[PDB]
Amino acid sequence: LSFSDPRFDDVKAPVDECKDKDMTYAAPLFVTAEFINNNTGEIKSQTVF
Amino acid sequence: RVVRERMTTQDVEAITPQTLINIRPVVAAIKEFFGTSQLSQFMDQNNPL
Amino acid sequence: IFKVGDTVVYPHHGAALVEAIETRTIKGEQKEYLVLKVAQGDLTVRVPAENAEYVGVRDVVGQEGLDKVFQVLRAPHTEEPTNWSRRYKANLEKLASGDVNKVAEVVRDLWRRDQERGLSAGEKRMLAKARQILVGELALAESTDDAKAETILDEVLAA
């Protein structure tokens, strides 16, 4: 199993709204995983949150 | 650790990265760093200095 | 037979398209990898040009096997072993076999036992997955309007 290429989305809520609504200020993270079968030969590339 | 554990138990040809990957310890590690640590402190604001 | 534009069926990932033939280098040689685009989890599966039939990449179905799996779905036979563990193992093996008639047997047994008793959340997830792969297979096979594929599934479940 292999990971590659981290990539961020946009922030889900701005700073003053996050400070007012008592919610953390974050952004989602995406990692392109890849699962390789050695003897048979397959690659299952996906996208994981 | 749990990826290489559950990689061998359930069979080949049925596994995918989204069934291999469990993001709960990663997100709990980030949350338990940002809360309840002595290096992530409350910001000391009485004034700009 | 595998050119660009097919609709082939993987063993237990569902029916998928093809869009390219990759000549990706392995051992200094360009083995003809063919790519897949299966839309249940948007994963791309790339397989060598000759081991696809070994792993069970099965072509689409458009003949009297449709009537065969219809009479398999509307068959009178319903028998399972006494213990739920062996019953689940046998149904999981028939699901992982990747055959349309066997998947039809799995969904008719699970749907009969769920409309009679109601078993479990794990077998509910199993029935949802097998119904998803059967509905998607026939809807991309006959090109017969998916979720009206679910209406004709309701028809053959009513039998």
mmCIF file of C-alpha atoms in Angstrom:
data_model
loop_
_atom_site.group_PDB
_atom_site.id
_atom_site.type_symbol
_atom_site.label_atom_id
_atom_site.label_comp_id
_atom_site.label_asym_id
_atom_site.label_seq_id
_atom_site.Cartn_x
_atom_site.Cartn_y
_atom_site.Cartn_z
ATOM 1 C CA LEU A 1 0.000 0.000 0.000
ATOM 2 C CA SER A 2 1.390 3.392 -1.008
ATOM 3 C CA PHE A 3 0.490 7.014 -0.277
ATOM 4 C CA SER A 4 1.207 10.017 -2.487
ATOM 5 C CA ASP A 5 0.342 13.659 -3.221
ATOM 6 C CA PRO A 6 -1.341 15.412 -0.270
ATOM 7 C CA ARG A 7 -3.800 18.097 -1.282
ATOM 8 C CA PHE A 8 -5.964 20.525 0.681
ATOM 9 C CA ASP A 9 -9.437 21.859 0.004
ATOM 10 C CA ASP A 10 -10.755 25.287 0.963
ATOM 11 C CA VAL A 11 -11.536 26.309 4.528
ATOM 12 C CA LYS A 12 -15.080 25.371 5.457
ATOM 13 C CA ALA A 13 -15.836 28.478 7.548
ATOM 14 C CA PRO A 14 -14.095 31.866 7.898
ATOM 15 C CA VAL A 15 -12.233 33.179 10.912
ATOM 16 C CA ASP A 16 -14.841 35.348 12.645
ATOM 17 C CA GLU A 17 -17.562 32.749 12.081
ATOM 18 C CA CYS A 18 -15.302 30.047 13.531
ATOM 19 C CA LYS A 19 -14.512 32.250 16.521
ATOM 20 C CA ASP A 20 -18.188 33.018 17.110
ATOM 21 C CA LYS A 21 -19.798 29.594 16.591
ATOM 22 C CA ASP A 22 -17.194 27.771 18.766
ATOM 23 C CA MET A 23 -16.036 25.589 15.874
ATOM 24 C CA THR A 24 -12.449 24.917 14.878
ATOM 25 C CA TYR A 25 -10.886 26.491 11.804
ATOM 26 C CA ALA A 26 -9.819 23.711 9.491
ATOM 27 C CA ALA A 27 -9.509 22.435 5.934
ATOM 28 C CA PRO A 28 -9.964 18.914 4.541
ATOM 29 C CA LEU A 29 -7.009 16.756 3.530
ATOM 30 C CA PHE A 30 -6.918 14.322 0.600
ATOM 31 C CA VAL A 31 -4.294 11.625 0.021
ATOM 32 C CA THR A 32 -4.070 9.541 -3.161
ATOM 33 C CA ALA A 33 -3.618 6.017 -1.833
ATOM 34 C CA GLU A 34 -2.514 3.116 -4.017
ATOM 35 C CA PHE A 35 -2.697 -0.625 -3.323
ATOM 36 C CA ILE A 36 -0.407 -2.890 -5.359
ATOM 37 C CA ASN A 37 -0.622 -6.668 -5.690
ATOM 38 C CA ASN A 38 2.855 -8.120 -6.149
ATOM 39 C CA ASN A 39 2.440 -11.652 -7.511
ATOM 40 C CA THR A 40 -0.746 -11.126 -9.524
ATOM 41 C CA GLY A 41 -0.289 -7.507 -10.594
ATOM 42 C CA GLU A 42 -2.999 -4.937 -9.882
ATOM 43 C CA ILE A 43 -3.127 -1.340 -8.721
ATOM 44 C CA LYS A 44 -6.169 0.116 -6.952
ATOM 45 C CA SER A 45 -5.648 3.870 -6.874
ATOM 46 C CA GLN A 46 -8.249 5.767 -4.857
ATOM 47 C CA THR A 47 -8.613 9.056 -2.977
ATOM 48 C CA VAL A 48 -8.825 9.005 0.816
ATOM 49 C CA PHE A 49 -10.075 11.720 3.160
ATOM 50 C CA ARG B 1 -0.155 -0.955 12.437
ATOM 51 C CA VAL B 2 -3.840 -1.698 11.918
ATOM 52 C CA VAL B 3 -3.332 -1.483 8.140
ATOM 53 C CA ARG B 4 -0.766 -4.284 8.187
ATOM 54 C CA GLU B 5 -2.946 -6.142 10.684
ATOM 55 C CA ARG B 6 -6.180 -6.101 8.672
ATOM 56 C CA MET B 7 -4.336 -6.521 5.361
ATOM 57 C CA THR B 8 -3.797 -10.239 5.994
ATOM 58 C CA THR B 9 -7.011 -11.215 7.809
ATOM 59 C CA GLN B 10 -9.582 -10.317 5.173
ATOM 60 C CA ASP B 11 -8.835 -11.877 1.822
ATOM 61 C CA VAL B 12 -7.062 -10.621 -1.271
ATOM 62 C CA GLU B 13 -9.053 -9.309 -4.298
ATOM 63 C CA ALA B 14 -11.696 -7.868 -1.937
ATOM 64 C CA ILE B 15 -9.702 -5.146 -0.215
ATOM 65 C CA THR B 16 -9.545 -1.516 -1.295
ATOM 66 C CA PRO B 17 -7.683 1.453 0.226
ATOM 67 C CA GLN B 18 -10.917 2.869 1.660
ATOM 68 C CA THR B 19 -11.428 -0.385 3.576
ATOM 69 C CA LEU B 20 -7.754 -0.624 4.526
ATOM 70 C CA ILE B 21 -7.348 2.915 5.886
ATOM 71 C CA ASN B 22 -8.721 3.905 9.311
ATOM 72 C CA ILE B 23 -8.103 7.616 9.947
ATOM 73 C CA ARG B 24 -9.305 7.620 13.566
ATOM 74 C CA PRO B 25 -5.835 7.412 15.251
ATOM 75 C CA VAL B 26 -4.481 10.170 12.972
ATOM 76 C CA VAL B 27 -7.330 12.563 13.692
ATOM 77 C CA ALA B 28 -7.242 11.683 17.399
ATOM 78 C CA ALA B 29 -3.495 12.360 17.465
ATOM 79 C CA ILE B 30 -3.986 15.820 15.959
ATOM 80 C CA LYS B 31 -6.868 16.638 18.332
ATOM 81 C CA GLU B 32 -4.933 15.396 21.373
ATOM 82 C CA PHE B 33 -1.995 17.527 20.344
ATOM 83 C CA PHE B 34 -3.996 20.717 19.923
ATOM 84 C CA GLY B 35 -5.897 20.162 23.147
ATOM 85 C CA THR B 36 -4.319 19.030 26.441
ATOM 86 C CA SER B 37 -0.689 19.769 25.595
ATOM 87 C CA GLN B 38 1.713 22.142 27.302
ATOM 88 C CA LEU B 39 3.073 23.526 24.036
ATOM 89 C CA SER B 40 -0.310 24.455 22.545
ATOM 90 C CA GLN B 41 -1.109 27.290 24.922
ATOM 91 C CA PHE B 42 -3.899 29.805 25.336
ATOM 92 C CA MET B 43 -2.930 33.015 23.568
ATOM 93 C CA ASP B 44 -1.867 35.677 26.052
ATOM 94 C CA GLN B 45 -3.694 38.759 24.812
ATOM 95 C CA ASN B 46 -3.992 41.765 27.028
ATOM 96 C CA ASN B 47 -2.452 44.035 24.379
ATOM 97 C CA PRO B 48 -0.672 43.803 20.996
ATOM 98 C CA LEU B 49 2.764 43.479 22.616
ATOM 99 C CA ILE C 1 -11.478 -7.960 -27.553
ATOM 100 C CA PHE C 2 -10.666 -5.266 -24.986
ATOM 101 C CA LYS C 3 -10.744 -2.012 -26.947
ATOM 102 C CA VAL C 4 -11.615 1.493 -25.772
ATOM 103 C CA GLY C 5 -15.324 1.843 -25.091
ATOM 104 C CA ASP C 6 -16.373 -1.463 -23.535
ATOM 105 C CA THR C 7 -18.387 -2.084 -20.367
ATOM 106 C CA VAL C 8 -16.791 -5.015 -18.582
ATOM 107 C CA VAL C 9 -17.699 -6.480 -15.190
ATOM 108 C CA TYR C 10 -15.139 -7.010 -12.442
ATOM 109 C CA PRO C 11 -15.586 -9.947 -9.976
ATOM 110 C CA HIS C 12 -16.935 -8.001 -7.000
ATOM 111 C CA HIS C 13 -16.401 -4.328 -7.764
ATOM 112 C CA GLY C 14 -19.193 -4.013 -10.327
ATOM 113 C CA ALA C 15 -19.407 -3.051 -13.972
ATOM 114 C CA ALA C 16 -16.780 -0.607 -15.190
ATOM 115 C CA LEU C 17 -15.727 1.236 -18.327
ATOM 116 C CA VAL C 18 -12.371 1.341 -20.098
ATOM 117 C CA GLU C 19 -10.644 4.448 -21.402
ATOM 118 C CA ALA C 20 -6.983 3.680 -22.200
ATOM 119 C CA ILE C 21 -4.398 0.956 -22.716
ATOM 120 C CA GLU C 22 -1.249 1.728 -20.741
ATOM 121 C CA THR C 23 2.166 0.422 -21.787
ATOM 122 C CA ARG C 24 3.620 0.926 -18.308
ATOM 123 C CA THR C 25 7.123 -0.464 -17.901
ATOM 124 C CA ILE C 26 7.657 -3.637 -15.876
ATOM 125 C CA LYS C 27 11.068 -5.403 -16.035
ATOM 126 C CA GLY C 28 12.063 -3.111 -18.894
ATOM 127 C CA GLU C 29 9.079 -4.272 -20.963
ATOM 128 C CA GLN C 30 5.753 -2.619 -21.764
ATOM 129 C CA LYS C 31 3.039 -4.984 -20.593
ATOM 130 C CA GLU C 32 -0.319 -3.891 -21.972
ATOM 131 C CA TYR C 33 -2.048 -2.547 -18.876
ATOM 132 C CA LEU C 34 -5.711 -1.706 -19.386
ATOM 133 C CA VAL C 35 -7.339 0.803 -17.067
ATOM 134 C CA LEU C 36 -10.777 0.741 -15.469
ATOM 135 C CA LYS C 37 -13.172 3.343 -14.080
ATOM 136 C CA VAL C 38 -15.642 1.797 -11.634
ATOM 137 C CA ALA C 39 -17.882 4.449 -10.131
ATOM 138 C CA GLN C 40 -18.835 2.994 -6.733
ATOM 139 C CA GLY C 41 -15.704 4.464 -5.139
ATOM 140 C CA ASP C 42 -14.066 6.048 -8.233
ATOM 141 C CA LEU C 43 -11.107 3.666 -7.968
ATOM 142 C CA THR C 44 -9.005 2.973 -11.040
ATOM 143 C CA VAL C 45 -7.944 -0.653 -11.497
ATOM 144 C CA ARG C 46 -5.158 -1.430 -13.963
ATOM 145 C CA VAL C 47 -4.609 -5.052 -14.982
ATOM 146 C CA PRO C 48 -2.297 -6.886 -17.419
ATOM 147 C CA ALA C 49 -3.750 -7.796 -20.803
ATOM 148 C CA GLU C 50 -3.810 -11.576 -20.216
ATOM 149 C CA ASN C 51 -4.230 -12.089 -16.449
ATOM 150 C CA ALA C 52 -7.655 -10.410 -16.540
ATOM 151 C CA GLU C 53 -9.280 -13.704 -17.496
ATOM 152 C CA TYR C 54 -7.264 -15.393 -14.746
ATOM 153 C CA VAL C 55 -8.541 -13.007 -12.064
ATOM 154 C CA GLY C 56 -12.047 -13.208 -13.492
ATOM 155 C CA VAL C 57 -12.730 -10.088 -15.541
ATOM 156 C CA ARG C 58 -16.024 -11.200 -17.062
ATOM 157 C CA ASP C 59 -17.722 -9.624 -20.062
ATOM 158 C CA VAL C 60 -21.241 -8.212 -20.131
ATOM 159 C CA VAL C 61 -24.321 -10.444 -20.390
ATOM 160 C CA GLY C 62 -26.994 -9.891 -23.043
ATOM 161 C CA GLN C 63 -28.609 -13.250 -23.883
ATOM 162 C CA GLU C 64 -30.805 -16.037 -22.365
ATOM 163 C CA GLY C 65 -28.650 -15.949 -19.215
ATOM 164 C CA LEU C 66 -30.930 -13.034 -18.297
ATOM 165 C CA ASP C 67 -33.873 -15.453 -18.335
ATOM 166 C CA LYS C 68 -31.693 -17.986 -16.505
ATOM 167 C CA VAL C 69 -30.954 -15.583 -13.655
ATOM 168 C CA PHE C 70 -34.614 -14.496 -13.691
ATOM 169 C CA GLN C 71 -35.747 -18.071 -13.056
ATOM 170 C CA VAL C 72 -32.905 -18.442 -10.537
ATOM 171 C CA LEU C 73 -34.233 -15.361 -8.721
ATOM 172 C CA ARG C 74 -37.773 -16.797 -8.919
ATOM 173 C CA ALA C 75 -36.674 -20.359 -8.006
ATOM 174 C CA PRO C 76 -38.492 -22.319 -5.266
ATOM 175 C CA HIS C 77 -35.302 -23.566 -3.589
ATOM 176 C CA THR C 78 -34.369 -21.928 -0.275
ATOM 177 C CA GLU C 79 -32.106 -23.942 2.042
ATOM 178 C CA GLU C 80 -29.289 -22.907 4.380
ATOM 179 C CA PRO C 81 -27.201 -24.759 6.983
ATOM 180 C CA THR C 82 -28.219 -24.742 10.626
ATOM 181 C CA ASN C 83 -25.563 -22.394 11.982
ATOM 182 C CA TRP C 84 -25.406 -18.752 10.962
ATOM 183 C CA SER C 85 -21.597 -18.790 10.700
ATOM 184 C CA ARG C 86 -21.478 -21.511 8.036
ATOM 185 C CA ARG C 87 -24.484 -19.957 6.280
ATOM 186 C CA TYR C 88 -22.699 -16.586 6.144
ATOM 187 C CA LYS C 89 -19.468 -18.237 4.957
ATOM 188 C CA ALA C 90 -21.251 -20.068 2.128
ATOM 189 C CA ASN C 91 -23.143 -16.951 1.039
ATOM 190 C CA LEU C 92 -19.919 -14.916 1.168
ATOM 191 C CA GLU C 93 -18.135 -17.501 -0.977
ATOM 192 C CA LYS C 94 -20.972 -17.433 -3.520
ATOM 193 C CA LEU C 95 -20.807 -13.627 -3.460
ATOM 194 C CA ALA C 96 -17.026 -13.567 -3.960
ATOM 195 C CA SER C 97 -17.298 -16.082 -6.817
ATOM 196 C CA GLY C 98 -18.350 -13.246 -9.121
ATOM 197 C CA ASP C 99 -21.062 -15.132 -11.022
ATOM 198 C CA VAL C 100 -24.398 -13.518 -11.856
ATOM 199 C CA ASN C 101 -26.509 -16.605 -11.124
ATOM 200 C CA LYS C 102 -24.740 -17.166 -7.797
ATOM 201 C CA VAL C 103 -25.249 -13.515 -6.808
ATOM 202 C CA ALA C 104 -28.919 -13.904 -7.787
ATOM 203 C CA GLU C 105 -29.113 -16.942 -5.496
ATOM 204 C CA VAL C 106 -27.530 -14.893 -2.692
ATOM 205 C CA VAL C 107 -29.961 -11.997 -3.083
ATOM 206 C CA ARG C 108 -33.025 -14.252 -3.334
ATOM 207 C CA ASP C 109 -32.067 -16.174 -0.179
ATOM 208 C CA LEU C 110 -31.217 -13.007 1.763
ATOM 209 C CA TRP C 111 -34.341 -11.172 0.585
ATOM 210 C CA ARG C 112 -36.576 -14.149 1.410
ATOM 211 C CA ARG C 113 -35.070 -14.497 4.885
ATOM 212 C CA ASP C 114 -35.262 -10.736 5.482
ATOM 213 C CA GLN C 115 -38.914 -10.504 4.438
ATOM 214 C CA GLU C 116 -39.622 -13.535 6.631
ATOM 215 C CA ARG C 117 -37.539 -12.817 9.749
ATOM 216 C CA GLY C 118 -34.998 -9.981 9.558
ATOM 217 C CA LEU C 119 -31.503 -11.163 10.449
ATOM 218 C CA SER C 120 -28.710 -8.677 11.073
ATOM 219 C CA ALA C 121 -26.965 -5.455 10.125
ATOM 220 C CA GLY C 122 -23.961 -7.282 8.665
ATOM 221 C CA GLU C 123 -26.075 -9.385 6.330
ATOM 222 C CA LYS C 124 -28.146 -6.261 5.626
ATOM 223 C CA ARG C 125 -24.950 -4.600 4.388
ATOM 224 C CA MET C 126 -24.158 -7.786 2.445
ATOM 225 C CA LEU C 127 -27.600 -7.789 0.800
ATOM 226 C CA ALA C 128 -27.240 -4.088 -0.033
ATOM 227 C CA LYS C 129 -23.843 -4.694 -1.655
ATOM 228 C CA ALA C 130 -24.988 -7.735 -3.645
ATOM 229 C CA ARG C 131 -28.183 -5.978 -4.740
ATOM 230 C CA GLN C 132 -26.054 -3.001 -5.809
ATOM 231 C CA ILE C 133 -23.749 -5.130 -7.960
ATOM 232 C CA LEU C 134 -26.663 -7.092 -9.493
ATOM 233 C CA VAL C 135 -28.722 -3.962 -10.252
ATOM 234 C CA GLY C 136 -25.713 -2.159 -11.726
ATOM 235 C CA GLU C 137 -24.732 -5.204 -13.793
ATOM 236 C CA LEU C 138 -28.142 -5.651 -15.400
ATOM 237 C CA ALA C 139 -28.739 -1.892 -15.764
ATOM 238 C CA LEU C 140 -25.481 -1.462 -17.663
ATOM 239 C CA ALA C 141 -26.059 -4.771 -19.467
ATOM 240 C CA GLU C 142 -29.463 -4.263 -21.056
ATOM 241 C CA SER C 143 -29.085 -0.429 -20.943
ATOM 242 C CA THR C 144 -32.419 -0.501 -19.178
ATOM 243 C CA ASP C 145 -32.642 2.739 -17.127
ATOM 244 C CA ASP C 146 -31.032 2.235 -13.684
ATOM 245 C CA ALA C 147 -33.592 2.428 -10.811
ATOM 246 C CA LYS C 148 -36.141 1.287 -13.323
ATOM 247 C CA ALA C 149 -33.804 -1.651 -13.117
ATOM 248 C CA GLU C 150 -34.806 -1.419 -9.453
ATOM 249 C CA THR C 151 -38.480 -1.420 -10.500
ATOM 250 C CA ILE C 152 -37.950 -4.583 -12.569
ATOM 251 C CA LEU C 153 -36.050 -5.952 -9.560
ATOM 252 C CA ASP C 154 -39.205 -5.269 -7.529
ATOM 253 C CA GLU C 155 -41.178 -7.127 -10.209
ATOM 254 C CA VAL C 156 -38.960 -10.209 -10.090
ATOM 255 C CA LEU C 157 -38.874 -10.081 -6.277
ATOM 256 C CA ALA C 158 -42.675 -10.130 -6.294
ATOM 257 C CA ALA C 159 -42.331 -13.046 -8.788
#
